[PDB]
């Protein structure tokens, strides 16, 4: 079995946040999972190359932010960056 | 030109002789009744521990009673809820969890959990309901750990008065009434050359070639796998290639002349040997 994991439960939670009375099929869920994984690999990769280009051996939130600025086009970036800076602030308000 | 295949005769084809089972389960108990009638000191059970065919019988006869491969197989059925374990020729080669007592390519026993069940099948089908001496064969220049483990299985598992190891080719020498010669014996695992001087083997200088009938079968399987190159629709087992080698191979007398003109068109219809499949 090996406990094959995914981003299922999280996608479901966010779905019920933005739309309480709206469901999702299995195929669409798999597509959302593949989307999450893809963006993850892309951002993390670009962040890795960012750290490597500047001879720095650490991927901080800065590299992630720059990677988002490079990858996500237009407003999608802006909002995302905000949603990041928010999160990392709250994490520093209870740690 | 229609001539080279117009008057060509219809082919004479041979089927596949795969080593299947055979419908016999004898619980032969007529050997112990004759064995207990002889005077003591002249009754012993002889087991040829052959790599292709373990043979076993009593010494006062001429043909061996059991002649089986070292194949065993054990199962568990959950649709029935029962553990199976039969061995020998009773395996069909429909299920196969086959593992052999001999290591593939060398006549040195190193699969003792199989050899124990093979000897178990031997002592069951000979009839043991209770202590006879054992004469048993081995390979030339056998490893000491294998002899130690075999002796441990003979004494500790079953319980025997005595056993003695010997080389089977030298037994066939002593039966053939020779005194001094050069025994060349090509077995299933290796081909030995042993000089014998006045009924004594000179084992300090015997030489074994590392080729045998199993190597014949495996190399024949490799060449039929690489000849029919684009994919052959058929299960190419090793044993059916062995039965091809048994009845379709002969050592040519003058090899370099026979070989170079072998695939000529004139007369290929009588050199070629053809094999069907179902």
């Amino acid at each position: 079995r090996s406990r094959k994991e995914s981003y299922s439960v999280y996608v479901y939670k966010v779905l019920k946040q933005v739309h309480p009375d709206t469901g999702i099929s299995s195929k669409a869920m798999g597509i959302m999972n593949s989307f999450v994984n893809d963006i993850f690999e892309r951002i993390a990769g670009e962040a890795s190359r960012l750290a490597h280009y500047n001879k720095r051996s650490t991927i901080t939130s800065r590299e992630i932010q720059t990677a988002v600025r490079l990858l996500l086009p237009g407003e999608l970036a802006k909002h995302a960056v905000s949603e990041g800076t928010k999160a990392v602030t709250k994490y520093t308000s209870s740690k | 030109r229609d001539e080279p295949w117009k008057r060509l005769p219809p082919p004479t084809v041979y089927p596949v002789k795969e080593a299947r089972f055979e419908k016999y389960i004898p619980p032969q108990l007529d050997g112990r009744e004759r064995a207990l009638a002889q005077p003591p000191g002249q009754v012993a059970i002889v087991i040829d521990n052959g790599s292709h065919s373990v043979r076993a019988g009593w010494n006062f006869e001429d043909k061996p009673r059991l002649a089986i491969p070292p194949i065993m197989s054990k199962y568990r059925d959950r649709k029935m809820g029962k553990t199976f374990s039969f061995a020998g020729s009773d395996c069909y080669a429909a299920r196969s969890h086959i593992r052999n007592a001999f290591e593939a390519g060398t006549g040195i026993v190193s699969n003792w959990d199989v050899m124990e069940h093979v000897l178990d099948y031997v002592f069951v089908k000979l009839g043991m309901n209770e202590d006879m001496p054992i004469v048993m064969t081995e390979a030339v220049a056998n490893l000491p750990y294998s002899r130690k483990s075999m002796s441990e299985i003979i004494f500790e598992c079953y319980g025997a008065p005595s056993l003695v190891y010997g080389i089977d080719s030298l037994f066939s020498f002593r039966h053939n009434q020779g005194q001094t010669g050069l025994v060349v014996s090509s077995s299933y695992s290796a081909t030995h050359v042993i000089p014998v001087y006045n009924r004594k083997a000179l084992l300090s200088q015997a030489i074994r070639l590392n080729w045998g009938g199993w190597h014949m079968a495996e190399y024949m399987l490799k060449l039929l796998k690489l000849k029919y190159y684009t994919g052959f629709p058929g299960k190419l087992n090793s044993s059916q290639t062995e039965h091809m080698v048994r009845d379709f191979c002969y050592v040519s007398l003058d090899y370099d002349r026979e070989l170079a003109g072998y695939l000529d068109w004139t007369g290929l219809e009588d050199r070629e040997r053809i094999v069907q499949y179902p």
């Binding site: 195929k27 798999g30 597509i31 593949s34 989307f35 994984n37 893809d38 | 684009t230 994919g231």
Partner: protein
């Protein structure tokens, strides 16, 4: 090894694909060309897929092999993994 199968991509199927693509009128020499293009495409994908299968020392081409092939070819496919 069966026979042909390039003709398995029948005429009304290609017509359907063109309909979904938004094509009003189709030439007669379109079908063979489409069969060729699809052949080249499938060759390029299956080659890399089988390569991934061989590197994993497997005799069964998995879906993830196809996904990896498509991703490295530049056509990421969602709904199967990765």
């Amino acid at each position: 090894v069966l026979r042909d199968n390039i003709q398995g991509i029948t005429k009304p199927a290609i017509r359907r694909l063109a309909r979904r693509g938004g094509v009003k009128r189709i030439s007669g020499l379109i079908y063979e060309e489409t069969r060729g293009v699809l052949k080249v495409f499938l060759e390029n994908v299956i080659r890399d897929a089988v390569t991934y299968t061989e590197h994993a020392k497997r005799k069964t081409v998995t879906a993830m092999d196809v996904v990896y092939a498509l991703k490295r070819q530049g056509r990421t496919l969602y709904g199967f993994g990765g």
